[PDB]
């Protein structure tokens, strides 16, 4: 059993008369009725209720999950499920992204960083003679406690209300494999040890949904081996989980994350859909965003390459 | 809050120092709260010595290399501070200081005295 | 082990003028970092907590700047009874002191 998902917002080409049915009919993709964005067969719900977070600059709902309200995201959580998957029975996949901060404390870094300081920062201001061991022990401890009870609590939310779906964050299990800090395509070794520690959402979770985006500055190795350390990093968590069966659904892309004029070419749709495929992958999912096909030009475009490339190897390698 | 210092005074080369604070108006089981060692020779600068957590967790300074030892007993609300092996170098008078939250408190200091 | 290195060693001034006293540390300390005021003795007496931040009844015209390894603290309108000694103390694991400065009475 292999299903491959549209999650592509071709809704966006309906307006110019392009529905996008081939996807289904010829390619054997599962897409929602009449390709709407959300429906029967997959729904994602962006950034939904008000997880804490810290907006390019300012604190929703406490800025760090510790400081955060936890009612008031479930209220207005529940208010936004409910308007953006109104059925009741939706059995399909259920995708959501906060994308906030890792619940990880020490995965936090780079642009994230700033949610490190806070959390610090906090400590600081409470216990000014504190040394940096007992802060940095406090500042993760209190993260790391209400970190997971927002998104565990969240998930359960989602689940109890839309009890038949296959619910999963995306992006986890992260790996951070080919950073210049872990240049092989293994996944780096105390990610892999904190994954283990964070069966707490693993066991909630349906569907792992790690994001296997390529990058055009790679190698055609390189390539292969970034979806192959992601896909082998959520396959292993997969088969230690105790609830239920986990589904393993990659996160796909058909533009190069750093090359996004540039669609995937042939040679790297067959080289790592046969990757996600030989490593029993349950399937995957075909992403897009909506700033690669807001002209009618560009969905043409888009669905000569649907029709000439990606529609092809789908078809010849998965279904 | 207050804290006094209490030693020997004097001894001689080669035996142990045993310094004991005492506090009141305060516990030292109060979560968050540390307590520190601090030394002055007359005429020279300030030396931190030891610290110790509400939670029995330590810090040295590791030039004292290390002769050192800090503990506390909460139900005697007592600190001690133990140097082995004193020199004539470790002549000073010796500090114990507490804080707790943005505030900071001394004790008045005990001389002690190391010589034949 | 981080190492504190206050200058100057000595610094003369009159009443009224303003001075900066110096603390550099050996490796970053973020803002853990501590500045004591010392009269003939008399305690030290705490003047800054996190580097910045003034501790309580000291005047305005105290203030403590910088983070990471370079550290001052400027004395604005100096009155009579600033002259003394003064010290930083660094708290990122250890918390060794520097060696200090004497605030000199220009004469």
């Known amino acids: 059993e292999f299903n491959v998902y549209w999650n592509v917002p071709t809704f966006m080409c309906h307006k110019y008369g392009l529905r996008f049915e081939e996807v289904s009919e010829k390619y054997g993709i599962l897409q929602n009725w009449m390709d709407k964005f959300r429906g029967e067969e997959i729904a994602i719900l962006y950034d939904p209720g008000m997880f804490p977070a810290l907006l390019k600059v300012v604190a929703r709902n406490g800025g760090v999950p510790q400081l955060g309200n936890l009612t008031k995201h479930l209220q207005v959580f529940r208010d936004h499920l409910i308007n953006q998957i109104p059925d009741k029975s939706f059995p399909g996949v259920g995708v959501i992204d906060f994308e906030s901060w890792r619940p990880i404390f020490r995965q936090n870094w780079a642009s994230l960083q700033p949610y490190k300081k806070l959390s610090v920062e906090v400590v600081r201001r409470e216990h000014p003679f504190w040394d940096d061991q007992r802060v940095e022990q406090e500042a993760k401890r209190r993260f790391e406690k209400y970190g997971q009870l927002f998104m565990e609590e969240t998930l359960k939310a989602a689940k109890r209300m839309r009890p038949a779906a296959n619910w999963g964050y995306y992006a986890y299990p992260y790996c951070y494999n080919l950073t210049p800090n872990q240049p092989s395509a293994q996944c780096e070794a105390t990610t892999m040890q904190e994954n283990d520690k964070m069966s707490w959402l693993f066991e909630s979770e349906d569907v792992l949904l790690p994001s296997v985006y390529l990058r055009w500055n790679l190698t055609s190795g390189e390539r292969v081996g970034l979806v192959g350390g992601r896909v082998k990093e959520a396959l292993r968590i997969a088969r230690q989980m105790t609830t239920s069966r986990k589904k393993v659904l990659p996160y796909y892309w058909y533009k190069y994350q750093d090359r996004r004029d540039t669609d995937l070419s042939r040679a790297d749709l067959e080289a790592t859909l046969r990757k996600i495929t030989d490593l029993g992958a349950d399937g995957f999912i075909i992403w897009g965003s909506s700033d690669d096909i807001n002209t009618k030009a560009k969905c043409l475009q888009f669905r000569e390459y649907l029709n000439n490339e990606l529609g092809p190897a789908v078809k010849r390698i998965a279904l | 809050v207050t804290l006094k210092e209490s030693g020997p005074g004097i001894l001689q080369p080669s035996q142990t120092l045993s310094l004991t604070c005492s506090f009141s108006?305060?516990?030292?089981?109060?979560?968050?709260?540390?307590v520190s060692w601090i030394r002055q020779p007359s005429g020279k600068g300030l030396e931190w010595l030891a610290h110790?957590?509400?939670?029995?967790?330590?810090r040295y300074n590791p030039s004292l290399k290390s002769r050192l030892t800090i503990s506390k007993d909460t139900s005697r609300n007592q600190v001690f501070l133990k140097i082995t092996s004193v020199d004539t170098a470790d002549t000073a008078t010796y500090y114990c200081?507490?804080?707790?939250?943005?505030?900071?408190?001394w004790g008045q200091g005990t001389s002690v005295t190391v010589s034949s | 082990d981080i190492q504190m290195t206050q200058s100057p060693a000595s610094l003369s001034a009159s009443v009224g003028e303003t001075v900066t006293i110096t603390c550099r540390a050996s490796?970053?300390?973020?803002?853990?970092l501590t500045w004591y005021q010392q009269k003939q003795g008399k305690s030290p007496q705490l003047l800054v907590y996190?580097?910045?931040t003034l501790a309580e009844g000291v005047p305005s015209r105290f203030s403590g700047s910088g983070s990471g390894t370079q550290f001052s603290l400027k004395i604005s309108s100096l009155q009579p009874e600033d002259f003394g000694n003064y010290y930083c103390?660094?708290?990122?694991?250890?918390?060794?002191f520097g060696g200090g400065t004497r605030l000199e009475i220009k004469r």
């Open positions: 110790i957590y509400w939670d029995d967790d330590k």
């Open positions: 108006g305060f516990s030292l089981s109060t979560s968050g709260m540390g």
């Open positions: 103390q660094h708290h990122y694991g250890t918390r060794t």
């Open positions: 490796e970053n300390i973020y803002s853990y």
């Open positions: 200081t507490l804080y707790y939250g943005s505030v900071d408190y």
């Open positions: 996190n580097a910045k």
